[PDB]
Design a binder for this molecule. Sequence first.
Ligand SMILES: *[C@@H]1O[C@H](CO)[C@@H](O[C@@H]2O[C@H](CO)[C@@H](O)[C@H](O)[C@H]2NC(C)=O)[C@H](O)[C@H]1NC(C)=O
Ligand SMILES: *[C@@H]1O[C@H](CO)[C@@H](O[C@@H]2O[C@H](CO)[C@@H](O)[C@H](O)[C@H]2NC(C)=O)[C@H](O)[C@H]1NC(C)=O
Ligand SMILES: *[C@@H]1O[C@H](CO)[C@@H](O[C@@H]2O[C@H](CO)[C@@H](O)[C@H](O)[C@H]2NC(C)=O)[C@H](O)[C@H]1NC(C)=O
Ligand SMILES: *[C@@H]1O[C@H](CO)[C@@H](O[C@@H]2O[C@H](CO)[C@@H](O)[C@H](O)[C@H]2NC(C)=O)[C@H](O)[C@H]1NC(C)=O
Ligand SMILES: *[C@@H]1O[C@H](CO)[C@@H](O[C@@H]2O[C@H](CO)[C@@H](O)[C@H](O)[C@H]2NC(C)=O)[C@H](O)[C@H]1NC(C)=O
Ligand SMILES: *[C@@H]1O[C@H](CO)[C@@H](O[C@@H]2O[C@H](CO)[C@@H](O)[C@H](O)[C@H]2NC(C)=O)[C@H](O)[C@H]1NC(C)=O
Ligand code: NAG
Ligand code: NAG
Ligand code: NAG
Ligand code: NAG
Ligand code: NAG
Ligand code: NAG
Ligand code: NAG
Ligand code: NAG
Ligand code: NAG
Ligand code: NAG
Ligand code: NAG
Ligand code: NAG
Ligand code: NAG
Ligand code: NAG
Lengths: 49, 445, 502, 138, 49, 149
Amino acid sequence: GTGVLTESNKKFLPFQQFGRDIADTTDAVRDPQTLEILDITPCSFGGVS
Amino acid sequence: AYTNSFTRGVYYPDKVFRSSVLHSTQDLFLPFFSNVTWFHNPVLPFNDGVYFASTEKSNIIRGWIFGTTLDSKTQSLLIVNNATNVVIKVCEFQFCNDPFLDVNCTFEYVSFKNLREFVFKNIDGYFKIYSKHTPINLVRDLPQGFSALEPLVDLPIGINITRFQTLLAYYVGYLQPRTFLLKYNENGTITDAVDCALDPLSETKCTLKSFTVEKGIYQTSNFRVQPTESIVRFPNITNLCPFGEVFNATRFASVYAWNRKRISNCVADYSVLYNSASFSTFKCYGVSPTKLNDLCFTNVYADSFVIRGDEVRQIAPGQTGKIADYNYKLPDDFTGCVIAWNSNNLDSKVGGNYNYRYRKPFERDISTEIYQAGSKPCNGVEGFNCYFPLQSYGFQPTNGVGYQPYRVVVLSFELLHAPATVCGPKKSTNLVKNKCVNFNFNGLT
Amino acid sequence: VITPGTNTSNQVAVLYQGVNCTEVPVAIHADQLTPTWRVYSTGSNVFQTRAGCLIGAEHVNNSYECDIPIGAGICASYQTQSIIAYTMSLGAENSVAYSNNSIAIPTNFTISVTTEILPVSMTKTSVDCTMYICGDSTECSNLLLQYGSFCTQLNRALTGIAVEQDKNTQEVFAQVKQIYKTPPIKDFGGFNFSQILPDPSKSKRSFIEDLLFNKVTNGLTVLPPLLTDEMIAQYTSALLAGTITSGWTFGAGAALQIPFAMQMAYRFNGIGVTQNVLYENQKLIANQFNSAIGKIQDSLSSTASALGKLQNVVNQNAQALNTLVKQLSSNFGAISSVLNDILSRLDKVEAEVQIDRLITGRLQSLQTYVTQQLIRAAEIRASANLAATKMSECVLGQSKRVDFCGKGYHLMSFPQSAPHGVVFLHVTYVPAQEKNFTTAPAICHDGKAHFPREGVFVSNGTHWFVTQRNFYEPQIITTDNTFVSGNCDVVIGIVNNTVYDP
Amino acid sequence: FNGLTVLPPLLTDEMIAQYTSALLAGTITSGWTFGAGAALQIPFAMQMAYRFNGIGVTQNVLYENQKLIANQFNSAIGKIQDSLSSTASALGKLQNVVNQNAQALNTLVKQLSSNFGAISSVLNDILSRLDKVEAEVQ
Amino acid sequence: TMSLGAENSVAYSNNSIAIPTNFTISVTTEILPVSMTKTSVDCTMYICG
Amino acid sequence: SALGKLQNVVNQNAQALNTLVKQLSSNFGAISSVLNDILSRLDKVEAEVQIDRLITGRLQSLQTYVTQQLIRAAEIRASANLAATKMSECVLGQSKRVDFCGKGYHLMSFPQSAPHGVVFLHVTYVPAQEKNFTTAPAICHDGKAHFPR
Ligand SMILES: *[C@@H]1O[C@H](CO)[C@@H](O[C@@H]2O[C@H](CO)[C@@H](O)[C@H](O)[C@H]2NC(C)=O)[C@H](O)[C@H]1NC(C)=O
Ligand SMILES: *[C@@H]1O[C@H](CO)[C@@H](O[C@@H]2O[C@H](CO)[C@@H](O)[C@H](O)[C@H]2NC(C)=O)[C@H](O)[C@H]1NC(C)=O
Ligand SMILES: *[C@@H]1O[C@H](CO)[C@@H](O[C@@H]2O[C@H](CO)[C@@H](O)[C@H](O)[C@H]2NC(C)=O)[C@H](O)[C@H]1NC(C)=O
Ligand SMILES: *[C@@H]1O[C@H](CO)[C@@H](O[C@@H]2O[C@H](CO)[C@@H](O)[C@H](O)[C@H]2NC(C)=O)[C@H](O)[C@H]1NC(C)=O
Ligand SMILES: *[C@@H]1O[C@H](CO)[C@@H](O[C@@H]2O[C@H](CO)[C@@H](O)[C@H](O)[C@H]2NC(C)=O)[C@H](O)[C@H]1NC(C)=O
Ligand SMILES: *[C@@H]1O[C@H](CO)[C@@H](O[C@@H]2O[C@H](CO)[C@@H](O)[C@H](O)[C@H]2NC(C)=O)[C@H](O)[C@H]1NC(C)=O
Ligand SMILES: *[C@@H]1O[C@H](CO)[C@@H](O)[C@H](O)[C@H]1NC(C)=O
Ligand SMILES: *[C@@H]1O[C@H](CO)[C@@H](O)[C@H](O)[C@H]1NC(C)=O
Ligand SMILES: *[C@@H]1O[C@H](CO)[C@@H](O)[C@H](O)[C@H]1NC(C)=O
Ligand SMILES: *[C@@H]1O[C@H](CO)[C@@H](O)[C@H](O)[C@H]1NC(C)=O
Ligand SMILES: *[C@@H]1O[C@H](CO)[C@@H](O)[C@H](O)[C@H]1NC(C)=O
Ligand SMILES: *[C@@H]1O[C@H](CO)[C@@H](O)[C@H](O)[C@H]1NC(C)=O
Ligand SMILES: *[C@@H]1O[C@H](CO)[C@@H](O)[C@H](O)[C@H]1NC(C)=O
Ligand SMILES: *[C@@H]1O[C@H](CO)[C@@H](O)[C@H](O)[C@H]1NC(C)=O
Ligand SMILES: *[C@@H]1O[C@H](CO)[C@@H](O)[C@H](O)[C@H]1NC(C)=O
Ligand SMILES: *[C@@H]1O[C@H](CO)[C@@H](O)[C@H](O)[C@H]1NC(C)=O
Ligand SMILES: *[C@@H]1O[C@H](CO)[C@@H](O)[C@H](O)[C@H]1NC(C)=O
Ligand SMILES: *[C@@H]1O[C@H](CO)[C@@H](O)[C@H](O)[C@H]1NC(C)=O
Ligand SMILES: *[C@@H]1O[C@H](CO)[C@@H](O)[C@H](O)[C@H]1NC(C)=O
Ligand SMILES: *[C@@H]1O[C@H](CO)[C@@H](O)[C@H](O)[C@H]1NC(C)=O
């Protein structure tokens, strides 16, 4: 993916490895080396007016 | 012997965290309130996947064996919780139905008031295990209520399980493809589920994606009456079509003056042609060749000739050139088959069978009249601008294959419009009325 | 599936629409091939209706009011329990006591307060259609150039919607030329507006505006409204403060102060009730009004189901955007819905032949979303024009249009703001406790026939009086309450009496 | 029958006929009063005097002409029968709503006959004539 | 930040009234659209030239 | 700038037609957007795939225009119903519906024609030069309350 990776408090179960929004977009991941959870936040976009 | 499954046998379907959401999925699950087989060992059919559970604390239920034979003939699963660890191996084992005490190897691995429950399935050669443990007091039935089973093992071991057994208080049931609504709580855990087919209220919950639904009337489904039977109504023709006379004839015509035989009022088994190894090509256009024995026609026309193997590329829909526009051209929407074979074993002379010769949709001119190819009136004599129209095939016995003779039959099919007249080897049924039925009238399904 | 609500019970009844019961439990329900719609030859009872075969419900001959509709005059309800189904009753049947010389006149009244709720604006939304279709993949973005204007006319269409939602919001609330504000003293003759005026301690919304604001619950971008919720609450404050301090006058030139009891005396005189009826009953009228505002706080606190017309706008936007985002996952016949799969797996001609499916599907999906918003925005604009009209006529005036500004005779109304909409509190007069009287069209005196100047003639059975049409107040029949035309010959049903001369 | 379906309205015509009767019987017996509150009975000629004040005609003008005014009204209602019985094309505004929905459905159904560039408009032809890999293109 | 307008404390009391002593006749223009350009496209000629 | 309502109704139809015409030049994935190129450069069996891409694009382009015109025509119909109402209530009468026939107390209005529209001069009475006074709801005389007629 592309995004701002951020530290997060979404308490995954031991076997859970990534997480999803209501519209199924991925919005969290475990780092497979240090087993804490990252939030994935989309990189900014918008209209230039 | 049997027991109620209640709402047991849901497992976490994926490694995906979801918060406080009523997610929905379709998968192999144990259906709610189904009959579960009960035991107090036998060899059991595995079907599409298993739910297994037992009341235990002794570990007399040491594990399981799974495979086709469960012994000798194949790599086969052995699983044993040996109190030191869960031990797994998949060897070509040599053991009977009870290798335990009184009370190749392509993979291996090492890890009542109580009950343990498990789910086993295999997909794409990945054998997969889910589990849970619990205390209980009502061990006299499968425990009412809900908690989620969770994964342990997922391995590409490839063994086709069809049978299994326990190793020496337990129950067995089977997974089925169903749609579920799953209540993930505000902590990433499944805490409740709806089996959508269980009753019209469960269809309604699954339609609204909610465990509670308001007072009202909700559409969940469409009903249609189903066919009770199938009907074949066909012509009662007894005659069989002359394909031996078409294909095995003494000599085919020239491509410039091609023959055509009508086939009518007979049953045609095109598998007699289509199965034959003899044909170098069997190019069928508006119909697939596999289907020909199931269709029906108003007429069939076998156009036929012998022609040089190189020109087969012009014997196709909408083509142009000397073989096509000056000999035999197919229409752009040709419904039919081009059937041919190399005929060098019969049509080839000792140096040149010059009797075979070459120069609109299904057009033919039989005339050998001189091409008056310019201003000079040729009056039947060749010269400059004055040429005999028919070139001759030099069919010797050892020509290169593009220069060899080939025998051709092109079947053109007349579709059903008028009544059935050439038809497949289908057998007519009795006729049923007033019921819903599938039907087939002369190929009109 | 017909359901009592899972809150109340788990029983259900099922309707097979248009199907005949001689087929239904003999088909894909019961005794045939039966995917999903699992078997019962009778789920409790089977009952044919004009709407279809109805199963599980119990037929009943008492015509109740309709709880759940089915169709063709049938309804279902949960009662002593089972799901009963019945032909509905339209209402209680009342033979009016009509006769050619009898009239009923109210001897007393009730003030009432009623709530009306209207949508005003959608979520202002816009989409980068190249980012939606191609996700910054260059090969897809280059294929999309072959389609020309499509990913530009879509932005022009959504821009028209987004600008209109600011206009609707401005047209409804910005009716007032200046921010009128309330006196420090609260001597409004006994009336208590404290629940609908600003709470200065909070945003500075009223108490009831805070009930309303509590009860309502990528390639895509969502844009803020031009006016903040704090600005909208200042316009509802100004419209309310004008109405309390100056009547309708702030709707036609500059605001003119007037004592609130005298403003109410004009509102009464506008509905044909003589103004002395107000000043003589002022404490009773204030007690009815102060009580009626309290019932609105209870009504909006007791259920969230009241705001359904506003809540539905928020739900319809969420429904559409979730659908538009989910449509990214669809195959449309392509070998993958993830564009980089196609680009990694296939040679460039095979990849572009596939990617043009995803572009075609995503474009057909995006035109479908924009076309729904174009239609939905016209429906919201038809409501916003009505809300602008309601505020112009009811709040800034006293509309005489029957049932336009709430039920009963209209007195005045107060606007309160709510999420994506507006809420009116319409105040109305309802006549309440009638008596029968004998009546006549004219009275004959010294051969001259007298008619009433205002009101109507009545008798208690021994004496004749004149009284106003909307509140019983009998008076002596004089030359000053009456006027003459003709004589006793022409009028039907004329009676003899003395008509007194002062 | 082609995957189309039509549904009944919630209120049947005899229920609508009860509402048009009730509104009319209220209006005749009780003026506008049954809108604002309970139906207060009033003599019908006296209700017409209240209607005449509403248009700036002094009410004695009704009572001094009541037989004439009743005759003009009774006569005028009779002409409405003749107008409706004569001229069906007066209901164009209702007939149009029928005719549009009928042509919308008939256009949706006739479109099943279009090829769109496939071998047949009949889906079972492709499934009979072509093997599955070829059929799925059509 | 946009201004909503001036602000104005109306001089209310239980015994004060303001009465106008003069008037302006005032003329207000209002403009409304009523019809589009009547337009037709022959699809047979637009698509296939 | 006052006539922005009418000038917008001229502008929107121009932008729609210019967009509908410009789309004839788009390829839609055919080898040319000009039909006579494909007809002259290709045999029919090749040309028919190219021409079916152009038909597909030009048809979807035209459906989009007609759908916008149907929705725009409903917006202008709603405005014509409002204008027809203002004509009957303001011109042929004297309305009492606050702010309907122009701001202030309504006296009358005069129509004037305009291209694609109508213009009303609403004539109104607006009060001015207010004076403060002391007031009371009623007066008592011989112990009896008098109210103004
Ligand atoms: C009927 O006669 C015509 C000539 O009058 C035949 O025309 C042939 O047309 C094809 C292309 O369609 C040309 O390639 C041939 O060269 C033409 N033949 C000659 C001899 O010029 C036509 O084929 C005849 N009809 C049938 C059924 O064969
Ligand atoms: C008119 O109706 C009001 C209620 O709307 C009557 O007021 C009630 O009168 C009873 C005694 O008759 C009291 O117990 C209640 O507390 C009163 N309620 C209020 C709100 O004051 C009133 O009496 C009626 N007027 C007449 C003249 O009959
Ligand atoms: C106006 O009415 C409000 C309530 O509608 C009165 O305020 C409430 O009074 C009760 C009893 O004293 C308290 O329980 C509430 O907490 C009060 N609420 C608030 C927000 O103050 C208010 O006192 C009345 N004012 C007048 C002038 O009568
Ligand atoms: C009809 O109304 C009149 C006037 O109120 C009633 O006449 C009065 O009756 C009382 C006794 O109830 C006497 O004290 C008055 O002197 C009477 N006044 C006059 C002018 O006669 C009359 O009683 C009422 N009739 C009915 C049937 O209630
Ligand atoms: C109104 O009063 C007049 C008398 O002032 C009544 O007229 C007389 O009625 C009697 C009985 O019917 C007749 O014998 C006389 O010939 C009538 N005189 C005239 C001049 O007509 C009249 O009947 C009373 N009307 C009502 C309805 O009571
Ligand atoms: C008012 O006009 C009506 C007609 O619109 C007149 O009524 C008719 O009068 C003539 C005699 O003049 C009768 O022959 C008709 O039969 C009447 N028509 C009806 C329906 O009754 C009426 O006379 C006029 N009144 C005045 C005062 O001029
Ligand atoms: C990977 O190694 C690092 C140290 O090299 C250690 O901190 C980390 O926990 C390890 N993670 C796993 C999953 O082994
Ligand atoms: C299977 O389950 C049904 C209830 O779902 C029950 O009636 C039936 O007795 C069960 N079958 C057996 C063999 O007990
Ligand atoms: C369990 O298995 C291991 C080998 O996997 C073996 O060494 C060990 O002795 C076993 N323990 C018991 C208690 O059987
Ligand atoms: C292991 O596989 C080979 C063939 O690959 C087979 O001959 C042999 O019998 C297998 N081993 C056992 C113990 O059966
Ligand atoms: C599994 O069984 C099927 C026949 O049922 C066979 O075709 C397939 O090759 C087997 N696969 C493995 C990995 O044993
Ligand atoms: C989540 O789990 C923690 C303990 O891990 C518990 O304290 C908390 O109450 C749980 N919250 C929910 C919403 O289940
Ligand atoms: C042609 O003859 C051979 C035997 O000589 C036979 O096997 C074959 O079936 C015949 N051809 C057809 C089309 O039946
Ligand atoms: C069902 O909902 C109503 C309000 O809609 C509530 O009064 C009732 O208590 C609920 N039923 C139960 C069993 O609580
Ligand atoms: C339902 O079907 C039966 C025949 O099975 C028929 O006699 C009856 O008239 C039908 N009822 C209705 C309401 O159409
Ligand atoms: C309903 O009423 C009819 C008579 O109108 C009677 O025959 C029937 O038994 C009643 N049914 C029920 C369920 O009360
Ligand atoms: C009026 O009188 C009639 C009898 O004449 C009676 O039926 C009716 O109930 C009375 N209505 C009222 C409002 O008192
Ligand atoms: C009222 O109606 C009755 C019956 O029609 C009639 O006898 C009586 O004279 C009428 N009275 C009046 C005042 O119209
Ligand atoms: C009223 O206003 C006009 C100007 O609009 C002014 O000329 C006139 O003198 C004023 N009259 C009074 C009585 O104030
Ligand atoms: C009216 O009197 C109040 C004080 O009672 C004062 O504030 C206000 O400015 C006066 N207005 C005019 C127009 O004189």
